[PDB]
Amino acid sequence: TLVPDLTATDLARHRWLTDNSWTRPTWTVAELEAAKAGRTISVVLPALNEEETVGGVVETIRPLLGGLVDELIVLDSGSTDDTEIRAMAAGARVISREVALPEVAPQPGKGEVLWRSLAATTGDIIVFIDSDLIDPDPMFVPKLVGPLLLSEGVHLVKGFYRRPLGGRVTELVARPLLAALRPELTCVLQPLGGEYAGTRELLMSVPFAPGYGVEIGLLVDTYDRLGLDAIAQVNLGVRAHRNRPLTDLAAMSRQVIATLFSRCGVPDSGVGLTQFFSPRTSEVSLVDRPPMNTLRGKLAAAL
């Protein structure tokens, strides 16, 4: 709704940008493992036909397994290339969507994959890392769990990259719509980012938007449920932005809008996006997977 007591200048100076945003994280793996205090950490890589990059991402994280990281899983979304064998050969456990939750038939999309990994993992903390990253740095996982292990009351950590010496959906769609609908969340540098960590308590109890909606849906549901102070962001390093075609970005934008409208009380038409020059159509989903807590008691493998 209408928030005339908040201005763009207020946001640019917001205290949250100081206490909850680490622009130069300096934690070490030893002291983070020290602060685990009995909490376990699961790392999850969603993967659909990522044979060229998945091993390289797994390798940057594998030295943490058995120490800081307790579980390192690639959640395979029906890949037909060599994603699975290469992930296993890089030291990761690979789980299909069917094995993660066999009672429910798989739907397409990233959100489905991450939702199912809630049922396949056991960590009190779950880190998500895209498996298409070309230049993954081995400090990703430690910088994402920093605030969850040390700071009090953080439940979601979004990892951002500073741009070198620009994601267009993020800059033109996600952040401006957040300015209009959830203005405090414009403090989050990269709301659509694929690198983030969250507590199991939180993630088990919110729905999962399907497809490309999942990241922004999780951000907005966390904010609505727990306030801005429950969210943090950390600099993961200097990744430069990878190229995608505008037609991909247009359909992705449509789903980002539907997922945001869904959480912000805005009635979405449900009509997919047509593109011309001729016609090219795409589809949008308006139904989330319900909170995974909903399925408790009724699974062969317990939660």
271 binds its own copies (CB under 8 A): yes
Supply 13's token pair.
């100076």
Pattern 1-40, Cl ion, x by CB under 5 A: ----------------------------------------
Considering only residues 184 to 203 of the shown chain, the ones binding its own copies according to CB under 8 A are: 186-187, 189
240 binds its own copies (CB under 8 A): no
Count of positions on this chain that bind Cl ion (CB under 5 A)? 9
Shortest separation between residue 127's beta carbon and ligand BGC, angstroms: 14
What's the rounded Cα separation, in Å, for the pair 238 and 236? 7
Q: Where are the alpha helices (DSSP H) in the chain?
A: 8-12, 16-19, 29-34, 54-61, 83-89, 97-100, 110-120, 140-149, 168-169, 175-181, 200-203, 214-226, 246-263
Residue 212, annotated as binding a ligand: yes
Binds ligand BGC (CB under 6 A): choice among 115, 140, 196, 212 = 212
275 binds its own copies (CB under 8 A): yes
Residue 77, annotated as binding a ligand: yes
- The nearer residue to ligand BGC, 32 or 126, going by C-beta atoms, is 126
The secondary structure of residue 186, as a DSSP letter, is: G
Supply 52's token pair.
């060229």
192 binds ligand BGC (CB under 6 A): yes
Residue 21, annotated as binding a ligand: no
Residue nearest Cl ion, CB atom distance: 167
What's the rounded Cα separation, in Å, for the pair 270 and 178? 20
Supply 155's token pair.
């439940």
279 binds its own copies (CB under 8 A): yes
Supply 276's token pair.
């011309």
Residue nearest ligand BGC, CB atom distance: 194
249 binds its own copies (CB under 8 A): yes
- Measuring CA to CA, how many Å separate 36 from each of 31, 67, 69, 70, 148? 9, 10, 10, 11, 9
Binds ligand BGC (CB under 6 A): choice among 110, 116, 143, 158 = 110
4 binds its own copies (CB under 8 A): yes
Residues pairing with 158 in the sheet: 196, 233
Counting other chains too, the contacts that 263-271 makes at CB distance below 8 Å and 24 or more residues apart are 263/217, 263/220, 263/221, 263/224, 264/181, 264/182, 264/220, 266/181
Report yes or no: 36 and 149 within 8 Å, Cβ to Cβ. yes
Contacts of 23 (CB under 8 A, 6+ apart): 235
- Sign of the CA dihedral with 231 first, then 44, 141, and 236 last: negative
194 binds ligand BGC (CB under 6 A): yes
299 binds its own copies (CB under 8 A): no
12 binds its own copies (CB under 8 A): yes
**Residues annotated within a binding site:** 48, 50, 77, 109-110, 130-132, 167, 169-170, 212, 215, 242, 244
Q: Which residues bind its own copies (CB under 8 A)?
A: 1-4, 6-9, 11-13, 162-163, 166, 168-169, 171-173, 175-177, 179-181, 183, 186-187, 189, 246, 249-250, 253-254, 257-258, 261, 266-277, 279-284
